[PDB]
Design a protein around this ligand. Structure first.
Ligand SMILES: *C(=N)[C@H](C[C@@H]1CCCNC1=O)NC(=O)[C@@H]1[C@@H]2[C@H](CN1C(=O)[C@@H](NC(=O)C(F)(F)F)C(C)(C)C)C2(C)C
Ligand SMILES: *C(=N)[C@H](C[C@@H]1CCCNC1=O)NC(=O)[C@@H]1[C@@H]2[C@H](CN1C(=O)[C@@H](NC(=O)C(F)(F)F)C(C)(C)C)C2(C)C
Lengths: 306, 306
């Protein structure tokens, strides 16, 4: 038993982290086969940050202007190009530690692990959700850009996030590995704010099932609700609409516990309207929305990765 | 900015995980140089669990009775011995991925990362604290025994925990890597309960400093207190005594923020007496005690490991 916010093992990604320096700026890059992927703002000076013309700046760069290091080893850059907000640096050496991998654009509500890195070296690993407003609630300092987020399935690493910037609330924004931002953000030091966020309803339901599986059942009531009536309540409390797709995805947990999804919806309705009265669920005083249904099943069934 | 419960990167430990099977029982082992360390109850049948005589059971085992697998590769066992509640299986192959490592017995209040494993394969990584009552609040299923906990410093992995069992509250107990249990527990299926736990005061103070560093300062008041008077209040709320050693350890964070430790103690006193009135600190509705002062500094300063 027990339920923790658990990250994927990071070893396969650790072997891909490198340092990229251009001029005075150093950040992290991701080395896969003979390409290093990093945020394009590595080619900026501090002054270039209000409104850089990245296409112009890169025109004046040569391969030798990019210093790439894997541990102590220098990797010679033999070509370079820009794809949206990422640079692709071709190097003369293929990474011998390249895992089986894919590039994926994740959907809001989905979770992934972040391997926080500085100077090409890993600092720590933690699990995040793509928020409905296309931010993540991370932990990132100067020099962390190019740190990546990923999921693992069996032996395949699906890279889904590259870190680029921090927004006023202390929340974080970045791109997929093709360099397209999540959300309406741009890689320049101008006034930008996250949109209003919302709570990921299907994930809260998943975590309530995890609670039942671990024996924390005080919040289960005797009622049911319709989907439409539940979503009228969810809306008032800034929760995402629950769709039939979401209900279908919760099927496995509903089957395991014998609690119909709409019965769990009635129990969540009561929590939203009445609060928890100082009680906790799985050790938490707030409702948790950063576990997907798949996260719950994988952790409660012991899925492993090779 | 941001503050997350962050685990160490797990790659160095991933390379050390193996599967150990004896008879019908399979669990995890730790392969370092030419030795595999695992819980001794691998040699038990389900019936042997109420009160096994481990010394007797091991007498009847031969090297070939232990099937050790690293990935798909079998590792031939060429000797075996017991040290307290762990078995040491000498194998014919030294692990080529052995990191620089130490075995350490951690103190209550200290934190470490757990690499949860099944069948020798990693499932996930999360950060835990050794509770004052010598348990941890983990996430562990059948087959997880032999999963380890560790800290990293630079390139050195300090292994501090091996998982053995689950106690009635859904909390977890295990040994150091010399096989000595943390706390008054034994590796047998008999009635055992965790002692009453207490809150790790120095760690709560550390996390309040982390909050200030991230800009969450509403709970700072204008008062100070003496050490003695603070500990009278801490005692009532089941908090550990704060010692001068603890105050000295908080020195770096106190210097960084300019808030004297005893001034922070006065603010914590008020939180304990008055509650949070529905406010959060670093996103939490409860006071957090599983970050050490070193954890806070490392995460807020970006310490990395090579
Ligand atoms: C990558 N190394 C760095 C990560 C930041 C560093 C500050 C603390 N937390 C982080 O995630 N990225 C950047 O510094 C980055 C780059 C330049 C500015 N910027 C920002 O994150 C800025 N934020 C914003 O401009 C905005 F509010 F719009 F989000 C701040 C003000 C430095 C945080 C560009 C966007 C190219
Ligand atoms: C290791 N594979 C396994 C881990 C358990 C499995 C159950 C769910 N969570 C876990 O951490 N360890 C054991 O099964 C183990 C071994 C045998 C029984 N035991 C227990 O953990 C039991 N707990 C207790 O006896 C006690 F309450 F005293 F802590 C339970 C009842 C199976 C949980 C021995 C101690 C040799």
């Amino acid at each position: 038993s027990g339920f923790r916010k658990m990250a994927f093992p990071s070893g396969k990604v650790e072997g891909c982290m490198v340092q990229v320096t251009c001029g005075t700026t150093t950040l992290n890059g991701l080395w896969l086969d003979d390409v290093v992927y990093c945020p394009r703002h590595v080619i900026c000076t501090s002054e270039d940050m209000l409104n850089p013309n990245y296409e112009d700046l890169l025109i004046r760069k040569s391969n030798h202007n990019f210093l790439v290091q894997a541990g102590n080893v220098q990797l010679r850059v033999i070509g370079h190009s820009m794809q949206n907000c990422v640079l692709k640096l071709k190097v003369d050496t293929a990474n011998p530690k390249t895992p089986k991998y894919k590039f994926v654009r994740i959907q809001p509500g989905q979770t992934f692990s972040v391997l926080a890195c500085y100077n090409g070296s890993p600092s720590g690993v933690y699990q995040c959700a793509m928020r409905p407003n296309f931010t993540i609630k991370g932990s990132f300092l100067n020099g962390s850009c190019g740190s990546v987020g990923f999921n693992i399935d069996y032996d395949c690493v699906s890279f889904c996030y590259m870190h680029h910037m921090e927004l006023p609330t202390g929340v974080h924004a970045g791109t997929d590995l093709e360099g397209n931002f999540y959300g309406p953000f741009v890689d320049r030091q101008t006034a930008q704010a996250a949109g209003t966020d919302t709570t990921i309803t299907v994930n809260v339901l998943a975590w309530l099932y995890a609670a039942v599986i671990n024996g924390d059942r005080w919040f289960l009531n005797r009622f049911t609700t319709t989907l439409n009536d539940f979503n009228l309540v969810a809306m008032k409390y800034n929760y995402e609409p629950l769709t039939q797709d979401h209900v279908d995805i919760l099927g496995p947990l509903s089957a395991q516990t014998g609690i119909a999804v709409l019965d769990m919806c009635a129990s969540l309705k009561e929590l939203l309207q009445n609060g928890m009265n100082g009680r906790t669920i799985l050790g938490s005083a707030l409702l948790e929305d950063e576990f997907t249904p798949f996260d719950v099943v994988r952790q409660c069934s012991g899925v492993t990765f090779q």
